[PDB]
Design a binder for these strands. Structure first.
Ligand code: CL
Ligand code: NA
Ligand code: NA
Lengths: 176, 175
DNA sequence: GATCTGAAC
DNA sequence: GTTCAGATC
């Protein structure tokens, strides 16, 4: 019994088909950093709508920015990732992994592989999180403490200032 | 007509010449310019569908964590950032090939920028600012680098996961 | 050469 | 519901 029949051009082409695909994964109970992580939320597959819904658990941290997360499915570690945004925005991003957008080439291959795999496995996903302490830093004589890299914050400050000065962004930019 | 197809998104519309920059802002009018220094130049290589680099500020070519400004004939084409050196960010722009856009495996940004710069076919001045990097602590170890704390935390956890378990999670490919 | 990861709207 | 940005192999 073959896992799939097509000849993948890359790993992200191969969508996981069931929980059986996780059988050689590492149990979350054997995760070495587990004492630093706390259950944050669950992701609920909604196949009809081709998206993941969120069951908020650690309510006080749902709007917290800058985390490492672990997706666990029936006790198995499916992935470890990070976000400078809250979990909700990162899940929003995973929800870009739709078949249509993959065909358009407008979603990341990661978001496609993860959303489609989670929808197909069709189990609720536990999300454990760790929120690192954020350093204070200085840019142009002002102090910041946030989830951003200093280069990203600097770019943001500069672009928002650029827009106020010239009432436009450069032609090569769309995001701020 | 600038082009003839109905684009579905901005990134679909590739700039055709330096004339497309006529309404852009001059680099001389950039308020943060005293913080920036000419780092390098990008040289379009249409035959190989890529950008080459001429290093200018040689001492800074391996510096990580920068804001950059791409300037063509005195006009600001874009402002961006990278936690890597400029060389790796350009490598990433060089992923913007037509084939990979068809594959859906490059970013739309890299496609738009590579294709537009190849078509404009001018040398691009790259101005750079390297912010100071804060020191931060994770799991009793201190770091001073260009990474966000969450990205550094992920990298440390992932490498130590691989040490302990001799594998990465099935859902991971990058470290 | 080519892909992977996450941010923004 | 859909595209935008950049890190990595
Ligand atoms: Cl400005
Ligand atoms: Na990651
Ligand atoms: Na940017």
């Amino acid at each position: 019994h073959h896992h799939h029949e097509f000849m993948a051009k890359r790993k992200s082409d191969i969508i996981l088909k069931s929980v059986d695909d996780l059988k050689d994964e590492i149990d979350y109970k054997d995760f070495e950093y587990k004492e630093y992580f706390n259950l944050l939320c669950e992701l609920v597959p909604n196949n009809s709508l081709e998206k993941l819904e969120i069951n908020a658990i650690d309510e006080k941290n749902m709007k917290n920015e800058g985390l490492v997360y672990v997706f666990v499915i029936q006790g198995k570690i499916f992935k470890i990732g990070h976000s400078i945004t809250p979990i909700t925005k990162r899940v929003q991003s995973y929800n870009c992994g739709k078949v249509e957008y993959r065909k358009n080439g407008t979603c990341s291959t990661t978001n496609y592989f993860v959303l489609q795999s989670l929808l197909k496995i069709n189990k609720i996903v536990q999300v454990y999180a760790f929120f690192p302490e954020q350093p204070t830093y200085t840019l142009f004589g002002k102090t910041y403490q946030d989830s951003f890299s200093t280069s990203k914050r600097a770019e943001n400050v500069i672009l928002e200032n650029f827009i106020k000065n010239h009432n436009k962004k450069p032609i090569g930019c769309t995001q701020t």
